[PDB]
């Protein structure tokens, strides 16, 4: 790791930009846990299930 970060030290633009995509990782970490237990309406899930198979409105 010291070699890699000693080279990051020598960069000019990537060392100040390539980290800005990292908050997005924590965004996913938080939203996934929000979604693991989200309470939803049974009627909408049975009427409009997301990416469920054999939905004729999709085609199959």
């Amino acid at each position: 790791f010291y070699n890699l970060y000693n080279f990051v030290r020598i960069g000019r633009v990537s060392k100040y930009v390539c980290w800005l995509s990292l908050p997005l990782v924590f965004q996913r970490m938080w939203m996934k846990n929000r979604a693991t237990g989200m309470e939803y309406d049974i009627d909408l899930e049975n009427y409009a299930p997301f990416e469920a198979k054999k939905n004729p409105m999709h085609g199959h």
Binding site: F1, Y2, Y5, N6, V8, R9
Partner: protein
């Protein structure tokens, strides 16, 4: 022995943060100014916590 059992049991827990820890240590050794690292070593030789010193 029991020590080997504890080693092989705590291997997987103990090693989950070792990557990030070594990454931060190495990135500090690389990116940080060596005068700051020398001051840290000095303060630790003086029995002080250099992180608390820096915060203060």
């Amino acid at each position: 022995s029991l020590a080997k059992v504890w080693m092989y049991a705590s291997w997987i827990p103990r090693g989950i943060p070792k990557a990030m820890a070594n990454e931060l240590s190495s990135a500090a050794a690389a990116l940080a100014h060596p005068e700051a690292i020398a001051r840290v070593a000095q303060l630790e030789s003086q029995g002080k916590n250099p992180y608390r010193v820096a915060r203060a």
